């Protein structure tokens, strides 16, 4: 059976060896097609480095798809990858790190898919947490970071359609594309009364918002902040300005390890190509270059997407949403404790929340 090229790109220190070894289910494909996996290491995660690296791969080898993992908190990596995916019409999976941080409004012709929960799923997990502990009165803070509308709308849609006594008191929109020399964001935050605050922003943005919130007394007891996965990010990196008592929904390899993810990424791309080949007696030819995409555009399509989103493998449903997220991720609820460590305090599985505590101990 013919071989398709899959680049696995690893940014930052990695057990390459544990990774190769988990893919020894390579004797693991009984499909119309078999993977030819090439580990590439990358040191840098700026736009140029990421683009040139993938383009060089694509021109020195026939790449049917890319599996991408990094060890950064850089959500912009997801955006760069979507861009690259759409321009070259190459499947890219962001399975870990910045690459897996929510990218809202992917390009129409993107073939970029992320391990991790959608924005709207996280939003609903947050409300489930709040419902558990009868925290019905809350406000929202977001930046202009893409997704923030989907976040706010999802909350609003949920609570307006429910007979629970939700009270959404205030919704702040913080513009962090301008400097804060007029103390604008301070004056906005000062407006917050609610005991629960939902925050949607990036990790670096939260770092600043928390600093300001502290200055006006909003991070202590009486105030509980809840953030999504991308704010917590890498849980071994905890900014000093993050307040103890911070709650997050999280996906950062707790039970789902990188090796297992790379194995699943390879499988998804390989199953998808096999499925298309079996039905249409071709697959899309790997792009010879990025630098000729304007010419070759009528000759290319995102056909392979409909298969990429509907893979089951070794018994497990690895479906994506068409919005480009994992369908049924096992999520971990985590809490930043007195020792500034992130701590498991709940699981979200089978659209069901299982929390550790009935009453929150002091931290």
């Amino acid at each position: 059976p013919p071989s398709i090229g899959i680049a696995v790109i690893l940014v930052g220190t990695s057990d390459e060896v544990a990774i190769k070894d988990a893919h020894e289910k390579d004797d693991f494909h009984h499909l119309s097609v078999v993977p030819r996996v090439e580990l590439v290491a990358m040191n840098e995660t700026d736009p140029k480095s990421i683009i040139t690296r993938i383009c060089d791969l694509m021109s020195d080898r026939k790449i049917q798809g890319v599996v991408f993992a990094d060890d950064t908190d850089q959500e912009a990596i997801a955006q760069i990858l979507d861009f690259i995916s759409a321009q070259t019409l190459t499947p890219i999976l962001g399975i870990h790190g910045g690459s897996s941080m929510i990218m809202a409004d992917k390009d129409e012709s993107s073939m970029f898919f992320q391990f991790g929960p959608s924005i709207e799923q996280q939003a609903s997990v947050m409300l489930n947490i709040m419902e558990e502990y009868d925290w019905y009165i809350f406000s929202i803070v977001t930046t202009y970071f893409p997704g923030y509308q989907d976040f706010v709308n999802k909350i609003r849609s949920t609570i307006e359609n429910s007979f629970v006594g939700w009270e959404l008191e205030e919704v702040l929109l913080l513009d962090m594309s301008l400097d804060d020399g007029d103390s604008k964001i301070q004056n906005q935050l000062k407006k917050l009364q609610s005991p629960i605050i939902l925050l949607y922003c990036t990790k670096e943005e939260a770092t600043y918002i928390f600093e300001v919130a502290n200055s006006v007394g909003l991070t202590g007891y009486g105030y509980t902040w809840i953030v999504p996965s991308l704010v917590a990010g890498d849980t071994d990196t905890v900014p000093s300005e993050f307040p103890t008592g911070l709650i997050s929904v999280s996906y950062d390899e707790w039970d789902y390890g990188l090796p297992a993810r790379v194995r699943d990424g390879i499988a998804i791309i390989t199953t998808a190509a096999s499925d298309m080949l079996s039905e249409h007696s071709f697959i899309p030819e790997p792009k010879s270059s990025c630098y000729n995409t304007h010419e070759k555009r009528i000759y290319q399509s995102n056909m392979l997407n409909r298969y990429l989103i509907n893979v089951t493998f070794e018994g497990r449903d690895l479906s994506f949403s068409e919005d480009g997220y994992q369908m049924h991720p096992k999520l971990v609820i985590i809490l930043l404790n007195k020792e500034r460590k992130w701590e498991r305090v709940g699981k979200w599985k089978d659209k069901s929340l299982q929390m550790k505590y009935y009453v929150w101990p002091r931290m």
């Binding site: 140029k48 850089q74 861009f83 409004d105 202009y144 594309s177 301008l178 630098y291 304007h294």
Partner: protein, 358 residues
């Protein structure tokens, strides 16, 4: 020896690169430049988006540009890859000629100003016309894409807080038979119709509207610039009123004005303390320019009153204010200027308007 501060440009031709150079040179002559002194760094558009992104890194950001002017090329290649890459570092981008409303979206383009207004701002002119000619009941037809909905949002903001929109109809972009939609409009008592649509979609509207005899006497048609351009002109009904942004396509004028504004803003920036340099090159650099957001605020609130294109200011979305439009009227199948919107005021000229019918 002064500190050299680079301005970037991505422009359509080498002629325009030379214009950029000479504009920056004039800015240096005009200003006091013992402390800071501008340097032009420029490039023309690459043939695809990836090449363009790379070139921004290799050619511009490697020179530590404080800002990047960007023209819309004539003859599929948008500012977007430049906005994305510059936005990565919070280096302000100044659009010279791009009118699409999507670039007013801060989530997507979070350091983007432009010296021309978005198409949606044509609603400002429509509104003043509706007061002037006392059209208090209008039907609004828009394409169900971003641009169409942007125009609707903008008009409804102006109306819903006088004249009222008696209904709004949206249609799917690329629909050819629009008879269903237009019969719905024919039903209503309002006979002033406002249209936002692309060239080809306006064509479809015009044709269908003719079959239904809605282009004759009693009806008023009020549109923007796209809807009386190219093929849209070909089938436009006579008496139609539309708009042309004055200097909207003059890349040389806007280079000149943008450089003046940016030069002014740079010198204002360096009155303040703790100005950091932008990153030198893309490779290895993943942090934002710390001073980027400050420079954006300074640009946003810049005023240049004596610009070639008129009075330069920017609104909350970094879009051009006080833009000037030609008010155009199709008379015996010639586009004839019947007035201008001078930035805040409608000025009718001595050429008489002829309405649909008369």
């Amino acid at each position: 020896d002064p500190k050299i501060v680079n301005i970037g440009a991505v422009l359509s031709t080498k002629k325009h690169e030379q214009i950029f150079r000479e504009a920056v040179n004039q800015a240096n002559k005009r200003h006091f430049t013992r402390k800071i002194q501008l340097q032009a760094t420029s490039v023309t558009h690459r043939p695809n988006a990836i090449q363009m992104a790379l070139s921004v890194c290799e050619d511009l950001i490697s020179s530590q540009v404080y800002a990047i002017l960007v023209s819309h090329p004539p003859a599929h290649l948008t500012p977007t890859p430049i906005s994305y890459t510059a936005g990565f570092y919070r280096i302000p981008v100044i659009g010279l000629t791009t009118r699409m409303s999507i670039y007013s979206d801060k989530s997507i383009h979070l350091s983007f100003l432009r010296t021309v207004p978005p198409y949606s701002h044509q609603a400002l002119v429509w509104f003043e016309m509706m007061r002037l000619f006392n059209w208090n009941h209008v039907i609004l037809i828009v394409s169900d894409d971003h641009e169409g909905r942007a125009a609707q949002k903008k008009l409804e903001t102006l109306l819903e807080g006088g004249p009222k929109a008696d209904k709004v109809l949206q249609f799917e972009p690329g629909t050819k038979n629009l008879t269903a939609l237009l019969l719905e409009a024919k039903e209503l008592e309002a006979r002033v119709i406002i249209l936002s649509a692309s060239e080809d979609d306006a064509t479809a509207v015009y044709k269908s509207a003719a079959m239904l005899d809605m282009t004759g006497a009693g009806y008023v048609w009020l549109v923007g610039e796209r809807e009386i351009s190219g093929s849209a002109l070909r089938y436009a009904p006579d008496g139609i009123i539309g708009l042309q942004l004055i200097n909207g396509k003059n890349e040389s004028a806007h280079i000149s004005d943008a450089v003046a504004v940016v030069a002014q803003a740079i010198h204002e920036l360096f009155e303040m303390e703790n100005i950091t340099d932008p990153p030198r090159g893309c490779v290895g650099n993943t942090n934002i320019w710390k001073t980027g957001p400050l420079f954006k605020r300074v640009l946003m609130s810049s005023k240049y009153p004596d610009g070639v294109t008129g009075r330069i200011e920017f609104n909350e979305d970094g879009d051009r204010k006080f833009a000037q439009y030609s008010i155009m009227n199709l008379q015996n199948r010639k586009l004839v200027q019947v007035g201008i919107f001078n930035g805040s005021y409608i000025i009718q000229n001595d050429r008489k308007i002829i309405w649909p019918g008369g």
